């Protein structure tokens, strides 16, 4: 709101980037592994 939009300024985008990153982490909390990079295929994640 202060910046008037996510894409208005570079600093706004980075705030949006972290905003989406933190939200992105929150939406995919189960699939994340602490150390090893979790690996899955289309069938393993149920993607059709």
């Amino acid at each position: 709101a202060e910046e008037g939009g996510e894409n208005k300024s570079e600093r706004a985008k980075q705030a949006n980037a972290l905003h989406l990153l933190l939200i992105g982490f929150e939406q995919n909390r189960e699939r994340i592994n602490t150390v090893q990079n979790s690996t899955y295929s289309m069938d393993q994640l149920n993607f059709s």
């Binding site: 690996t39 899955y40 295929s41 393993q44």
Partner: protein, 49 residues
């Protein structure tokens, strides 16, 4: 070799182990033992003795 074995990163080691053998089978093992070199070593010492 004539084999074209491929490794899948989405399968576990055992899953690939079962899959690879189910595809090719014993002939791959024979090549592995041939490349091991134990057969040549036994023949060499046997000939010498």
């Amino acid at each position: 070799t004539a084999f074209r074995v491929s490794v899948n990163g989405y399968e576990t080691s055992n899953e690939n182990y079962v899959r690879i053998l189910s595809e090719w089978g014993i002939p791959l093992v024979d090549q592995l033992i041939h490349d091991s070199g134990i057969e040549s070593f036994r023949s060499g010492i046997g000939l010498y003795l």
